[PDB]
Paper text:
Serpins are proteins distributed among all kingdoms of life that act mostly as Serine protease inhibitors, but also as inhibitors of other classes of proteases, although some that lack inhibitory activity can serve as chaperones or storage proteins. Among these, [name] is able to weakly inhibit chymotrypsin and is expressed mostly in the parasite’s head gland, confirming its localization in the parasite-host interface, thus its potential as a diagnostic target.
Electron density was well defined for the main chain atoms except for some flexible, loop regions. The major region with no electron density is the Reactive Centre Loop (RCL; residues 357 to 368), which is highly flexible and solvent exposed; its function is indeed to act as a bait for the target protease to exert the [name] inhibitory activity. Other poor electron density regions were for several solvent exposed loops (AA 35–36, 107–108, 262–263), in accordance with other deposited [name] structures. Three [name] epitopes were identified: Ep1: 123-VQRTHEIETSFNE-135; Ep2: 175-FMDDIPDDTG-185; Ep3: 320-NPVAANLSGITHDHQLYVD-338. All three identified epitopes are clustered together in the same region of the protein. [name] showed to be able to bind human IgG in sera from people affected by Schistosomiasis, while the response of the protein to healthy serum resulted to be significantly lower (p < 0.001).
Author numbering: 21 to 34, 37 to 106, 109 to 261, 264 to 356, 369 to 403
């Protein structure tokens, strides 16, 4: 499927990885759905999303409406999820199309991104590359409510090309938070040679466990306050590559989630924060979208019909900060589950059954 294709060509890029293939879809749903990407260009997108209408033949009108409802379907769902003592959105997704101001955008394309998607068109001047970058930095700093300030893009396109940015943010409490009285400082076996300290978080409770001496990666799942989403940690029994097979899409996660039984667990978990800016232009080509990031052969006539443009940079930026209290929020055990060497964690969806956020941690920040 899509999420299983993305993690394939995204994880081969590695060191501390952090990606959210959930919203990257959203970034690109806003290309097909609105009607921006026509021809070969947008067809290659529908195909990579593996949707019905692209299965048989190019049919422009058709794949727009099916992406528009597919997006809108998943989009109110992650929005229908509200957590606290004032109700707050649990999932947070902004998606930004930064474009040369001079271009007469089609009023249909502009009508759709506003009333059809939750996303935002930003008209800026790339000639003023200096003033151009800060516009982006102010945009992302305004969307992440300060969590992701200091995002500075090293290079800018020469007038025709575009820049997309996607900011996923997942905020929630634990279902059973950690006592800070027991968050002590402990070693973390990075390698034989380097070992660092970190604030380990010790709690014992009933959590769904799973050992797989089959592959070599034991599994734990801690649910958040909103029980639909679970936080999953994958520990090797230091094999390391045995776990990644889950991370690059060779192994379905749910497939493994399903064998997790109620257990008592002595959980010791590092306090850490993961932030990780990524470019998906060399990823979305190897995954079958190569006619979009190319100036000669990109067809974004749905946006403008006076000057030809393409996508220069497809940027993503994420923040995962774990605390005793939850994620971004401030009993006799039968299983020990100490996490002091590198691991692979997920924010798993229990309804959509997909890992919205899949991360590989080498050294905890």
């Amino acid at each position: 499927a899509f999420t299983r294709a993305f993690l394939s060509k995204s994880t081969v890029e590695f060191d501390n990885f952090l990606t959210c293939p959930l919203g990257i879809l959203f970034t690109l749903g806003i290309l097909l759905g609105s009607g921006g990407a026509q021809g070969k260009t947008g067809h290659q997108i529908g195909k990579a999303i593996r949707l019905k209408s692209t299965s048989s033949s190019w049919n422009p009108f058709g794949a727009q409406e099916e992406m528009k409802s597919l997006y809108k379907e998943l989009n109110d769902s992650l929005g229908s999820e509200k957590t606290f003592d004032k109700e707050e959105k649990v999932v947070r997704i902004s998606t930004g199309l930064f474009v040369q101001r001079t271009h007469e955008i089609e009023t249909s394309f502009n009508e759709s991104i506003k009333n059809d998607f939750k996303g935002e068109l930003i008209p800026v001047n790339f000639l003023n590359r200096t003033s151009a970058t800060l516009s982006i930095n102010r945009w992302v700093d305004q969307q992440s409510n300060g969590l992701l300030e200091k995002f500075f893009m090293d290079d800018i396109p020469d007038d025709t090309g575009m820049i997309l940015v996607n900011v996923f943010y997942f905020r929630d409490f634990w279902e059973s938070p950690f006592e800070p009285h027991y968050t002590k400082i402990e070693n973390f076996d990075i390698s034989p040679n380097r070992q660092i300290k970190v604030p380990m978080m010790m709690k014992e409770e009933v959590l769904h466990y799973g050992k797989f001496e089959n592959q070599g990666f034991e599994i734990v799942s801690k649910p958040l306050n909103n029980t639909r989403f679970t936080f999953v940690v994958v520990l090797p029994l230091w094999s390391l590559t045995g776990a990644m097979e889950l991370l690059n899409g060779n192994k379905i996660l749910s497939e493994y989630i399903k064998k997790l039984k109620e257990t008592t667990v002595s959980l010791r978990l590092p306090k850490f924060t993961l932030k990780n800016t990524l470019d998906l232009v060399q990823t979305l080509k190897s995954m079958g979208i190569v006619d979009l990031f190319n100036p000669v052969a990109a067809n974004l006539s749905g946006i403008t019909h006076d000057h030809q443009l393409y996508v220069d940079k497809f940027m993503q930026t994420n923040i995962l900060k774990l605390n005793e209290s939850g994620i971004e929020a401030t009993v006799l055990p039968d299983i020990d589950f100490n996490v002091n060497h590198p691991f692979i964690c997920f924010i798993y969806d229990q309804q959509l059954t997909m890992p919205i956020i899949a991360a590989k941690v080498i050294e905890p920040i």
